[PDB]
């Protein structure tokens, strides 16, 4: 058990799930920054990496 799956499971496997997947679920919920003046301007965040 402790060889494949150590004693700091609860700290290491949490941040490693934040970096891999749980960043892409943030920019996909804050994409498309817009302006009301000059309405043909748009900036969108497609993907994110660390």
């Amino acid at each position: 058990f402790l060889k494949v799956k150590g004693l700091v499971k609860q700290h290491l496997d949490s941040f490693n799930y934040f970096v891999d997947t749980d960043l892409k679920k943030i920019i996909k919920a804050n994409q498309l920054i817009l302006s009301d003046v000059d309405p043909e301007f748009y900036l969108k965040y497609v993907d994110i990496r660390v």
């Binding site: 817009l34 009301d36 309405p39 043909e40 748009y42």
Partner: protein, 66 residues
């Protein structure tokens, strides 16, 4: 893009909820769609001292125009 209405059998000569106001972005959206899509390489946007300045190159004059 004026105000539109409709003929409902229930409510005749009724005014619709959506065209009351305008989006002001859908007509901007189609304008953007037929634009060129370029992939930026960091060497293209190179700037020097001869950048963001006055002037151009005049066409060298001809004997016709003399």
């Amino acid at each position: 893009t004026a105000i539109q209405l409709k003929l409902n059998p229930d409510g005749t000569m009724a005014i619709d909820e959506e065209t009351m106001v305008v989006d002001r972005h859908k007509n901007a959206s189609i304008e953007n769609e037929y634009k060129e899509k370029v992939d930026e390489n960091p060497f293209a946007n190179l700037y020097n001292y001869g950048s963001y300045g006055r002037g151009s190159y005049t066409d060298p004059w001809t004997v016709e125009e003399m």
